[PDB]
Amino acid sequence: IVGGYTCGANTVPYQVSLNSGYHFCGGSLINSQWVVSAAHCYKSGIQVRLGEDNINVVEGNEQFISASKSIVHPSYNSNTLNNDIMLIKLKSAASLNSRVASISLPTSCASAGTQCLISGWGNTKSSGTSYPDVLKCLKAPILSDSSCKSAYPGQITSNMFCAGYLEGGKDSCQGDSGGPVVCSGKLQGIVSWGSGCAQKNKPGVYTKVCNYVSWIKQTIASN
Ligand SMILES: [Ca+2]
Ligand SMILES: [Cl-]
């Protein structure tokens, strides 16, 4: 997260860190045994880390659980990043409490101008590389489809939306991928891609979760 602020320990209870000896992507807990993340975050040997704040120190409240299965959307395209969404089933159910809770799936899509909270342990610099120890937060509005497509001509599909600031300085970044974009208590987006980070006229692009609600439910019900 570039230009954000320190969330505060356990203030984003549904945030998860995907770990393979180091943090590589974020994710969102949607129920006691399933996590939603980005398809481009896929890899074998994933350990899901819940209830984290400082990812480099065991502080208490953390729950480490191995992924038993990762389900990348069958129509995911690695070149265009269309359908950049993945479901991860936990080997065992997480213990839900005030520090580890699930986030609700949307019943309807969000409209332009809606304020959302984006969070993660991704890079905090636009011109450099520096990963934070604690979870960072950023409040950002969903942009109109018109401005989104003007910013990235021919690259925005109906399964994506832009959020952020055109003047630059505030954006999600590398390492935040797969993380949550929550608006009005509902998971509306997944950190997916963008051109650089926090650059002028290049807002972040996010997977539009409202288009996948039925797919998520049907997939979870059969696994
Ligand atoms: Ca920790
Ligand atoms: Cl276009």
Helix (H) or strand (E) holding 221: helix 213-221
The catalytic site residues sit at 40, 84, 177
Residues spanned by CATH 2.40.10.10 within the chain?
1-12+103-210, 13-102+211-223
Q: Is 171 annotated as a binding residue?
A: yes
Count of Cβ atoms closer than 10 Å to residue 215 Cβ: 15
Yes or no: say if 18 and 39 are a contact pair by the CB < 8 Å rule.
Answer: no
**C-alpha of residue 188 to centroid of ligand 1, in Å:** 26
Count of Cβ atoms closer than 10 Å to residue 33 Cβ: 18
Give the tokens for residue 150. 């003007």
Q: How far is CA 98 from each of CA 9, 54, 135, rounded to the nearest angstrom?
A: 12, 17, 17
Q: Rounded to 5 degrees, what are φ and ψ at 132?
A: -75, 160
Q: Is 213 annotated as a binding residue?
A: no
1-12+103-210: CATH architecture: Beta Barrel (2.40)
Yes or no: say if 50 and 63 are a contact pair by the CB < 8 Å rule.
Answer: yes
13-102+211-223: CATH architecture: Beta Barrel (2.40)
**C-alpha of residue 93 to centroid of ligand 2, in Å:** 43
Q: Is 59 annotated as a binding residue?
A: no
**C-alpha of residue 170 to centroid of ligand 1, in Å:** 25
For this PDB entry, the determination method is X-ray
Alpha-carbon distance of 121 to 25, in angstroms, equals 8
The 10 Å CB-count burial string (b at 16+, else e) for 98-126 is ebbbbbebbeebbeeeeebbbbbbbbbeb
Q: Is 57 annotated as a binding residue?
A: yes
Q: Give me the sign of the Cα torsion angle 65, 58, 18, 110.
A: positive
The burial class, CB within 10 Å (0-12 / 13-18 / 19+), for 39 is buried
**C-alpha of residue 160 to centroid of ligand 2, in Å:** 13
